[PDB]
């Protein structure tokens, strides 16, 4: 493939031309961090970002998969996505009536939020957190799981980033989700709370006020041994 | 990205600029306003073939390497592209060197002409800081 020619095709107003080039960029960006760097180096990101405004949903879906894959790279690669201006459009796409488009935007955000504290901070400043908390009440379990993974990533930052998650009203939903019949939802809720519990005394005290302790205690004896250890370890961080 | 006032103030405070070299956070926010209008991608070409980059308009002759400026010293040991990021770390780290270069914030021409001597704490009043 010629990456420069792919990137120039994104100057097209022709919607069939735009969809074929987006598909190729996305596939290349799936091939690991040197491939991601080639896509970045060719000047792909400005056009990928502008295209998140395409009223055409198939063009939108492809652009999101490309951006999502780039954001699976290292912290400098994530930062290039941020620098290109992806976040506002990504947050707006959390309100998409199309659940597939929602999932993809949520995945891209989750990947940006899996970077360092500066990448997490960009996600917070862009206004993702209230949307992610809302999405914890989604009827769609895939949406719920992806929203929990993004929150858990944000809550892996510094104490101020944790406190942003607390301030967005995450804790009641998270404590509630420790009662999910779905073990993956439970494990993700548990991970999120465990990350919040690694903050300062104020953060730990908020987790205790939300009633996490009673439920984490119960979970030390869950049938799943990985959940037992996760709960035993969250409790240790709170009791600390 | 175009920062908001308090958004940039909080970012600069988290990065250690509040009362760095005795310059209150309002000085740095004011300097950014008048240098870049809070635009991280701002660039200014100078007649001497250098360019000023980013939120604090850091010059390519003395401080950062853009690979196109004659007589360049790259004293911040940083590519000028890093100074256009929304992650302000590199512009802040370079600013801390600049401000220490013997002239305080007089290194920033727009600071000297628009901010110096003013009520610069107005730029941070209202912020959660």
From Swiss-Prot, chain B:
SMART domains: LYZ1 (SM00263). GO terms for biological process: cell wall macromolecule catabolic process; defense response to bacterium; defense response to Gram-negative bacterium; defense response to Gram-positive bacterium; killing of cells of another organism. Its EC number is 3.2.1.17. CDD domains: LYZ_C (cd16897). The active site is at residues 35, 52. Substrate binds at residue 101. Lysozyme C is capable of both hydrolysis and transglycosylation; it also shows a slight esterase activity. It acts rapidly on both peptide-substituted and unsubstituted peptidoglycan, and slowly on chitin oligosaccharides. PANTHER family: LYSOZYME C. This is Lysozyme C. It comes from Gallus gallus (Chicken).
């Amino acid at each position: 493939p010629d990456l420069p020619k792919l990137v120039k095709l994104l100057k097209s107003s022709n919607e069939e031309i735009l969809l074929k080039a987006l598909r190729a960029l996305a596939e290349i960006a799936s091939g690991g961090n040197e491939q991601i760097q080639a896509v970045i180096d060719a000047g792909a990101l400005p056009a990928l970002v502008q295209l998140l405004s395409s009223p055409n949903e198939q063009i939108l879906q492809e652009a999101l998969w490309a951006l999502s894959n780039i954001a699976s790279g290292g912290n400098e690669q994530i930062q290039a996505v941020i620098d290109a201006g992806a976040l506002p459009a990504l947050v707006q796409l959390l309100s998409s009536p199309n659940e597939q488009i929602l999932q993809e935007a949520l995945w891209a955000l989750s990947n940006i939020a899996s970077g360092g504290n500066e990448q997490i901070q960009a996600v917070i400043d862009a206004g993702a957190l209230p949307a992610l908390v809302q999405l914890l009440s989604s009827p769609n379990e895939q949406i719920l799981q992806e929203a929990l993974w993004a929150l858990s990533n944000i809550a892996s930052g510094g104490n101020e980033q944790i406190q942003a998650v607390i301030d967005a009203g995450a804790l009641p939903a998270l404590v509630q989700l420790l009662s999910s019949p779905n073990e993956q939802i439970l494990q993700e809720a548990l991970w999120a709370l465990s990350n919040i519990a690694s903050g300062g005394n104020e953060q730990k005290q908020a987790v205790k006020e939300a009633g996490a302790l009673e439920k984490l205690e119960q979970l030390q004896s869950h049938e799943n041994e990985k959940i037992q250890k996760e709960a035993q370890e969250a409790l240790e961080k709170l009791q600390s | 990205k175009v920062f908001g006032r308090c958004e940039l103030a909080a970012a600069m405070k988290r990065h250690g600029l509040d009362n760095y070299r005795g310059y209150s956070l309002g000085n740095w926010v004011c300097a950014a306003k008048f240098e870049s209008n809070f635009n991280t991608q701002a660039t200014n070409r100078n007649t001497d073939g250098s360019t000023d980059y980013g939120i604090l308009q850091i010059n390519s002759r003395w401080w950062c390497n853009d690979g196109r400026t004659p007589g360049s010293r790259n004293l911040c040991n940083i590519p000028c592209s890093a100074l256009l990021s929304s992650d302000i770390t590199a512009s802040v780290n370079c600013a801390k060197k600049i401000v220490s270069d013997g002239n305080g914030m007089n290194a920033w021409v727009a600071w000297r002409n628009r901010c110096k001597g003013t009520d610069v704490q107005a730029w941070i009043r209202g912020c959660r800081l």
